[PDB]
Every structure is written in structure tokens, then in C-alpha cells.
Amino acid sequence: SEVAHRFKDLGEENFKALVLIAFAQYLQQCPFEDHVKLVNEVTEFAKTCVADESAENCDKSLHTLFGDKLCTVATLRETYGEMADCCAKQEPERNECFLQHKDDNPNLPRLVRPEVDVMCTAFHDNEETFLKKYLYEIARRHPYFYAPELLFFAKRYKAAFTECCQAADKAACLLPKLDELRDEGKASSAKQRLKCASLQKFGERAFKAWAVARLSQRFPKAEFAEVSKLVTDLTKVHTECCHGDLLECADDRADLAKYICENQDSISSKLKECCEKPLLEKSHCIAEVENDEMPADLPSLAADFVESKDVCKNYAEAKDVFLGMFLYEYARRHPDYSVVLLLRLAKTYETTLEKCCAAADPHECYAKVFDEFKPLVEEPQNLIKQNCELFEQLGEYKFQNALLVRYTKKVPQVSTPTLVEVSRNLGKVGSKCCKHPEAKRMPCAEDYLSVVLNQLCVLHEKTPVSDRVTKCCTESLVNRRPCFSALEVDETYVPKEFNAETFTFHADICTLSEKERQIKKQTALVELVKHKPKATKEQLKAVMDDFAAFVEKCCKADDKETCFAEEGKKLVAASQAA
């Protein structure tokens, strides 16, 4: 096992795909015919490394080889500025600036989709060149996308594209497949961006606590040792795949799939059918599985940590192992609880217990600790129940209207389309999981909503305008949502002056599509409510009703903007009646 580059475990066909995405992930050079001969020269380098070792220099580090072989590519300084700092050797490495040297750069405008015949013929003659073109096309938009998932999308692309040219269906055979592949790629790119961003920001202990809470919730039938080995190997895979070294990432995911499909008896009872799959299907199928059933007999954990007097000696012997025992025993029993709430309860437990061992008499200090968990769980169930019944009462468009009229008085200095996009995404989250029962509502409420808040945080991080929004972003991830939800109104906002030309419209608004009419409607609504900062919402509902009736009155009218001159005149005549 002295070989430093064993691609024979991966195979020759899989080796060429994983180096092209790494070259797209290291630089964004728009010619790519040199990328094919780059793949060819590194695979003949690999074929010379096959079966003889002492005659060559194949006993080197692969990250050093990514350092040195990229210098021969980067010879043009005005197009490749990655040689500006150093030559990127092993010990003076600059991978820590190569990670964000081109990250979040949408340099390409858009991808076009022509008619079915041209790439049907390109699939008919140049199919592997079309697949390389698709990997080069999708590898330039999101650079922090999960590298064992691209082979799954390429296999699904080949399987969904090998039958549409043969069958009579051409547009409808592939177009919703392309739409759902783009939507699944956007969702998985957002999830991988959130996970690698949390690993880059909040250390490693928070990632280990989050993953032991999730693995305690998913697999309840296992003991602590298999959970500890699984969380150590998953922490290793995610700390060495959001960084580079993609070959080790794919091989480590492969042996984790081998270990989880070879020791399935003591861990779970539902993935026995899931392990009867191909290898890429085995890698994808494990990450979305149903959680198992509860154990039949389980005692209360109040008997283990209250009347047991000798618990601080176990805490002084081991801290994080003892908190791992407490978090595993608390998250095995409650499947409806969110992971963020469980991390809040574990943090409250450790900051109570490190104060209670500071006292002289610790057994009277932790006599009442389970009363403090009642207001930490009494709030968000009532909040989710109240907003879910508001969605069940008013309907979805009025729910989006209510969430846009509610948050506009909290932070009234943020711009228009950021507010419109955040209110429409929270309307989608509120319409997503009120069709579920009460047990399956909290992970919807703390899973879909966490993408929208850090999306808003990285949108406000580029252009900082407010201060209390950025103050909530600088805290920990376990208290970001109560930092946002405990905001009140501000009295420091100046009332905006009266515009006269944006309240009026044009008579082709009925010719627009309904989504564009809605974007115009909440645009004029958010300008209308930022004109009047006073809490006069009891008149605003009737004003909204006669405004909607009086804009559909002019839809029946055909005066060709003459009725629209009398429309906005009566609206600004009725504007002062407040």
C-alpha cells in the first residue's frame, strides 16, 4: 500500500470525470479544448504510474501535484492571476486563498436551450463530448457543489436522454426532467453551501454536535460506539471534501457506503432494501432514508442526572463525551423535535451545569433544571401553530400579503426586491408543510426556513445597510432565528415623501402574466406601506379591497390609458383619507 495514487479502485472511466470538475473548480478559463488534453496528459501520467513505481515520481502528495501541474497551465498572467502570490508549493501553499479566489462569481450570463434536434444529433454522434460539455457547463455555476453527486446527475441525464430521441415524445419527454434536475441541483447546491459554510465559519465542535443530533434522530436502535465511529468518519469526509482532494472524498464515501452496507444489522432496520442497489445508488439512497421506530421500553433520563450525586466527577473526567451521552439520550426519544432546539437545550444544560459545579453545594443547584426546558419548548410550537392556522384561514396570497405587511415595519431601511423575495419564500415555506400532521411540521419549519435566513444574510452581507440585521448574523447558528423573531418596531424611521409617478400605472398590466402582476402588486404595496409608517392596518384592508376592485374595474374598461388617468387620480384623492 505504498502507492500514493490508486485510481484503480475508482476505475479509468471515473478518473477522467473527477479531474475535469476539479479543473473547473480551480480555474474558470472559458476555452476548454486544452482541458481534454489536460485530462489526457494526466491519465497517461497515471498509466505510467500503473505497475511501476521506483522508475517514476508517483510517490508524492496529490495536492502537491495539483500545485505543480497547474503552473504549466497558468502561464498567461493577464487571464490566470493565480500565480501572483507564489508558485503554490506544498509548505507555502495558497489553497486557503484558492478556495475563495473565484467563489460566488456568476461570470457566465445564462445557459440557453435550443430545439431538440441539434443536441439529439449531438447525442447521436458526440455523446461523450456532449457529457463533457454538460459537466463543464454545470461545473462553472456553483463551485461548491457536492462532487460525488455529479456522477449521479450525469447518470440520470444519460438515462433520461437515451430514450427521448428514440420515442415519439421530444419536448415533453425531457423538459420537466430538465426543470426538476435544475431545481434539485439548486436545492442541493444551497444545502451543500450551507453545510460547508457552517463548517468554515463555526469550527468543528458545532458540526460534530449537529451531526450527532441528526444521527441520534435518524437511527435510534444503535448504541453510542457505532454513532461515534460514524460521526468521526462523516466529519472526516466533510472536512476533506469542502476543501479539495476530491479523489479521497469519493473513495472515503465509497468505503463509508461499504461499511454502512456491511454492518446493517445493529444499526437500522429499514435500509436493508436500500443496500440492494448499485454503488452510486447506495451512496445516494442512504442520505435520504426514513427514520426508524422508537424502542419499546425506555426509562426517564431524570433519574440519571438529578438524584445521582456523583455526576460532576463524570463531567470533570470528560466534558464533551458526557455532553455527547446527554445529547444522544435526549435526541433518541423525541423524533418531532428540531436539531436547532436540541442544540439550544444542550447548550442551556451545559451552561447550567458549569455554574452548578462552581457552587459549594451542587446537588441543590440542579434540583430544578427541567422546569427551564418548558419555556424553551413552549414558544416555537405555539408560533408554528399560530402561523399555520393563519395560512389555513386566509389562503396563500393573503398569507404572503400578511408576511410582507408584517416585516416591513421591523426593518424599514432594506430595499424593495430583497423584501419581496424573502416574503415570497416564507410564503412558500408556510404553504409547504401545513399539509402534514402535527408531528411532521417542526423539521419542515426548521429545515426549509434556515435556507432563507442565511440566503438573506449573505444577500445583506454584500451590501450592509441596516445594523440589527448584521448583529443577528454575527451570533451563533442556534440563536439566529430568535434574534430575528424578537425584533420590535422602530421609531427612528423618517416618513418617506410622497411620490406621484409610481402609484399610477399603465393599462397593459392586464396583458402581463399573473406572477408579474403579483410582483407589481407587492412592489406598489411595499412602497405604499413605507410611505405611511403608522399602524393604521384596520383601514388598509378596506383600501386594499377597493384598490383591487378599482383596478379590476379598469380591466373591463377599454379607454386605452384614459381610464388609467382617472384611476390614479381617484386613488391619490382617496390617499389622504387616513
From Swiss-Prot:
Pfam families: Serum_albumin (PF00273)
One GO BP: cellular response to calcium ion starvation
Residue numbers of Phosphothreonine PTMs: T79, T416, T418
Variant or mutagenesis effect after changing D265G: In Nagasaki-1
Residue sites binding Zn(2+) per the record: H63, H243, D245
Subcellular compartments: Secreted
Glycosylation sites noted in the Swiss-Prot or TrEMBL record: 8, 47, 133, 158, 195, 221, 229, 272, 277, 309, 313-314, 319, 347, 374, 409, 435, 440, 490, 521, 530, 532, 541, 569
Variant or mutagenesis effect after changing K368E: In Naskapi/Mersin/Komagome-1
Disulfide linkage: C49-C58, C71-C87, C86-C97, C120-C165, C164-C173, C196-C242, C241-C249, C261-C275, C274-C285, C312-C357, C356-C365, C388-C434, C433-C444, C457-C473, C472-C483, C510-C555, C554-C563
InterPro entries: ALB/AFP/VDB, Serum_albumin-like, Serum_albumin/AFP/Afamin, Serum_albumin_CS, Serum_albumin_N
Chain sites annotated for binding Ca(2+) 2: D9, D251, D255
Gene Ontology molecular-function annotations: antioxidant activity; copper ion binding; DNA binding; enterobactin binding; exogenous protein binding; fatty acid binding; identical protein binding; protein-folding chaperone binding
Residues annotated with N6-methyllysine modification: K530
Location of Phosphoserine modifications: S1, S54, S61, S269, S415, S485
UniProt KW keywords: Calcium, Cleavage on pair of basic residues, Copper, Disease variant, Disulfide bond, Glycation, Glycoprotein, Lipid-binding, Metal-binding, Methylation, Phosphoprotein, Repeat, Secreted, Signal, Zinc
Known outcome of mutating C173F: In Hawkes bay
Recorded GO CC terms: blood microparticle; cytoplasm; endoplasmic reticulum; endoplasmic reticulum lumen; extracellular exosome; extracellular region; extracellular space; Golgi apparatus
Modification sites for N6-succinyllysine: K201, K432, K515, K560
PANTHER family for the chain: ALBUMIN (PTHR11385:SF15), SERUM ALBUMIN-RELATED (PTHR11385)
Family: Belongs to the ALB/AFP/VDB family.
Protein name in the entry: Albumin
Species annotation: Homo sapiens
Gene name of the record: ALB
